[PDB]
Write a protein that binds this DNA or RNA. Sequence first.
RNA 1: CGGUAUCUAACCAGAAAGCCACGGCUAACUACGUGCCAGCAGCCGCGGUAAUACGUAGGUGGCAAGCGUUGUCCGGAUUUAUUGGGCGUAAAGCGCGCGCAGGCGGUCUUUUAAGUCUGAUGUGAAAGCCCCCGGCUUAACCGGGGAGGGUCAUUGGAAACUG
Lengths: 81, 157, 135, 131, 199, 88
Amino acid sequence: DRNQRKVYTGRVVSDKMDKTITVVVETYKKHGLYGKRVKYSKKFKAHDENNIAKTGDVVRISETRPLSATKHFRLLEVVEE
Amino acid sequence: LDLEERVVTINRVAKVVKGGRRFRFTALVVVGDKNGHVGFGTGKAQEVPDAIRKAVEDAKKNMVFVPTVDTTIPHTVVGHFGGGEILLKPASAGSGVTAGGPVRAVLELAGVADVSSKSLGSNTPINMVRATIDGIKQLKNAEDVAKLRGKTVEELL
Amino acid sequence: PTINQLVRKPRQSKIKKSTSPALNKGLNSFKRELTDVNSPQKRGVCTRVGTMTPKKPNSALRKYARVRLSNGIEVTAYIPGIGHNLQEHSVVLIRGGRVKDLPGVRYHIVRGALDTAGVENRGQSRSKYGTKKPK
Amino acid sequence: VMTDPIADFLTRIRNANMVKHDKLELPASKIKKEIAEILKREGFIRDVEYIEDDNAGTIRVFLKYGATGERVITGLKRISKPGLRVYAKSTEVPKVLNGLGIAIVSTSQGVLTDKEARAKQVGGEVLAYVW
Amino acid sequence: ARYTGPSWKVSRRLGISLSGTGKELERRPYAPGQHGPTQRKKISEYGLQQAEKQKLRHMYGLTERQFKNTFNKAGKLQGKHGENFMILLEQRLDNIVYRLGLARTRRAARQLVNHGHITVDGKRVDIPSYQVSVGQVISVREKSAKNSAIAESLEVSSFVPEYVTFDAETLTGSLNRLPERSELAAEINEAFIVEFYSR
Amino acid sequence: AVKIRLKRMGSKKKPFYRIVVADSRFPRDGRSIETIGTYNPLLDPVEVKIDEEATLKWMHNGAKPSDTVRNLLSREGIMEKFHNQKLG
RNA sequence: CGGUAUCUAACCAGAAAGCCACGGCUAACUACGUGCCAGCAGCCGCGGUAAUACGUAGGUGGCAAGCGUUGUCCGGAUUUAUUGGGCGUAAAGCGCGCGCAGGCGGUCUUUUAAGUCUGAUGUGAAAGCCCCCGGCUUAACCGGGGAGGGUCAUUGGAAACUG
Ligand SMILES: [Mg+2]
Ligand SMILES: [Mg+2]
Ligand SMILES: [Mg+2]
Ligand SMILES: [Mg+2]
Ligand SMILES: [Mg+2]
Ligand SMILES: [Mg+2]
Ligand SMILES: [Mg+2]
Ligand SMILES: [Mg+2]
Ligand SMILES: [Mg+2]
Ligand SMILES: [Mg+2]
Ligand SMILES: [Mg+2]
Ligand SMILES: [Mg+2]
Ligand SMILES: [Mg+2]
Ligand SMILES: [Mg+2]
Ligand SMILES: [Mg+2]
Ligand SMILES: [Mg+2]
Ligand SMILES: [Mg+2]
Ligand SMILES: [Mg+2]
Ligand SMILES: [Mg+2]
Ligand SMILES: [Mg+2]
Ligand SMILES: [Mg+2]
Ligand SMILES: [Mg+2]
Ligand SMILES: [Mg+2]
Ligand SMILES: [Mg+2]
Ligand SMILES: [Mg+2]
Ligand SMILES: [Mg+2]
């Protein structure tokens, strides 16, 4: 019995920084008028505590309080490479 | 039988001869009865009343039938003769008949009480009448479809 | 076009153009710039009066007046009716409406509203041309 | 066919009607067989048969005409093409020709006619209009 | 009333004997004006709908704004649009006052109702547009029961319709039920009205 | 402070009030928290409808009725039973 | 507010109707005056000595305490066409090819629930449009109840189709 936080899954795209990983999340959205499913990817920032992730991996992240200027998401686990 | 004529248009056509021009009047006439039979005809003569006479005589050979369940066409249909198109839709009871120039005459001399229509193509009266006639020819009743497809009337719908 | 070709680049519709460009502009003196505001009539002072000749096949002597509006744009207008009283340095009110004959005239002077008077000896169609009801 | 086989099936039937053919054969598939069965059970064709071969199999259909022609099936069209797929809610299932025709909808319990999809109160991708 | 002028001219132009027994057309049944005996002109389609509309609003004598407003609010009831339009035009207090026999013309009934001589269900009402419902009773205010004109208005009574009730001892009437186009009017195609207003 | 109070609407010289709840600060016709009932004074026995148990629990939290609303609640018996369950 | 609403007596048809249009679209025609002049005009277009198109008069048609003109917006316009258009000659296939990203993808089995479909809960304030009752002598207007509006959040189901 406790309120929950949003959770996302995606692919790691950059790792050159320290303790952080950039994650891209992909989704459909139907167009406003012609009703066709179109791809759209939004790229996030996550806090990796031990530099575990690597470029190209498939990971799961969750939301948290703002931990930096542009980071507010936390790594949860690595789904796969 | 009891036929009610209605002149749709009268046009004055001309041909050029070495001595000048020669003018002839052509009449389009839609005839029919309020029971569900309607046809159209075209006549051409050097005088208007004789043009209407020729047009009604020609029209008296092109009767068709308009299935008119409950004073309404069974369903929507698009007539596409020539360069013109007419779209006909069933309408609610007591809504009148709303249509263009000649399609109104065609649908009112056939006895149809309630229908909606839109001229999606050209506006030449002859082509509008012909397209409306084609659209009517594309009409079929529920009983006929049930007979064709084996299923009885109620199981059909 | 395929639906993908419309997703990639949509349909841009036409754009219309105004036909009375003077009546939808105003002037602000403090910053000296033409603002956009649509007005049904507009007043101005006439800098000349005279007549023109219409296009073929019509033939007459059409009475115009060249005016300068409140926003600085100077145009040409047409005086309807039989006779007028306009002169130099006269203040008039103008409104849209083009005469087909005169190539340049595009606006149209309203009568009886300002320094310009009505049309004398009207009996009917009187609201236009601005004449009071006799007797 | 290369892109969409259901449209090919519909257009083969339509092409066969125009010249008053009697039967037609085409490659088989798990959805084409069920579409043919719906068409037969509804009353738009005469019969359907399955011929076996090496790779995938073949399906033949015997079309239906009245006593003097009068094509029993007078029109087909595809609604959800590969370039744009359309889905219908349970309260949006189309009614073809005021119920004179039928619409095929691939719901969660197989493919159904328009009528029976309004009995289970379910919807899904509309495939074709037949009338 | 609201439109004041000769009444034979309107009936002559429209071609029926609206609000009368033919008294407007026995002599000179042709249109007014300088023309009218000189020539007759073929009617266009727009003219047909225009005539069939003017045939009805001049009959009940109400202006265009009220006419379209009552058309629109009649369009909401279940059933047929023209029928419901023409039925609740018969529910105006003027119509019932005329039908009972308290006036000789709809103008007279309207002028009687304006001056407050008619009380609907015991309360005096001074307006001619009050749509009366089924089960309400109509009196003559008991202070103007014995007037000349209203007394002679029963000398030429055109016989009450079947959808009302009226007695002369109490000088009191009421609306029984609603008419259904099988009782009212015989020269008007309301479908033309619907076509004219649905263009 | 939060209080339950009347809110005016209707027409010129024909007023009609809706017993609502609001902060002191917010405008007379402005935003509210919820609607409690109605109040019509143009009848001989003034016409009132009150949700009762909703305003009963919603006055335990520290909402004080206006004077007129106090009169209406007293006539409706609400305040006596509020008092009772306060000491009961 | 305010002697405001409302009510009761007596007197007089007496104080109280204009605006636009009449060649066609567009419902409604005759006479006089003028003579490519005066002038009219939304488009087609009238006027050169017999003008239903200019000016006036008689009549007629729309509306009505209003009637017209101008300005802006939507419709008719399927004239940016998802619903709902096209490219041989009317406007419209790049001069042709190799091809990254992107778009689409033959047949069958098992699994998944991203897209798809469905149940429930929470929410989408009040006023507004709509439906049903009520109060103002009717109406406008004002009340009472309801519905509709979400590519919405949480949670549970179905697996044909796309992934
Ligand atoms: Mg004029
Ligand atoms: Mg009191
Ligand atoms: Mg006093
Ligand atoms: Mg007197
Ligand atoms: Mg006319
Ligand atoms: Mg003359
Ligand atoms: Mg004219
Ligand atoms: Mg004239
Ligand atoms: Mg008049
Ligand atoms: Mg008024
Ligand atoms: Mg106006
Ligand atoms: Mg305008
Ligand atoms: Mg458009
Ligand atoms: Mg091509
Ligand atoms: Mg060329
Ligand atoms: Mg070309
Ligand atoms: Mg090319
Ligand atoms: Mg080429
Ligand atoms: Mg596949
Ligand atoms: Mg793919
Ligand atoms: Mg709301
Ligand atoms: Mg009432
Ligand atoms: Mg309200
Ligand atoms: Mg309400
Ligand atoms: Mg499966
Ligand atoms: Mg499952």
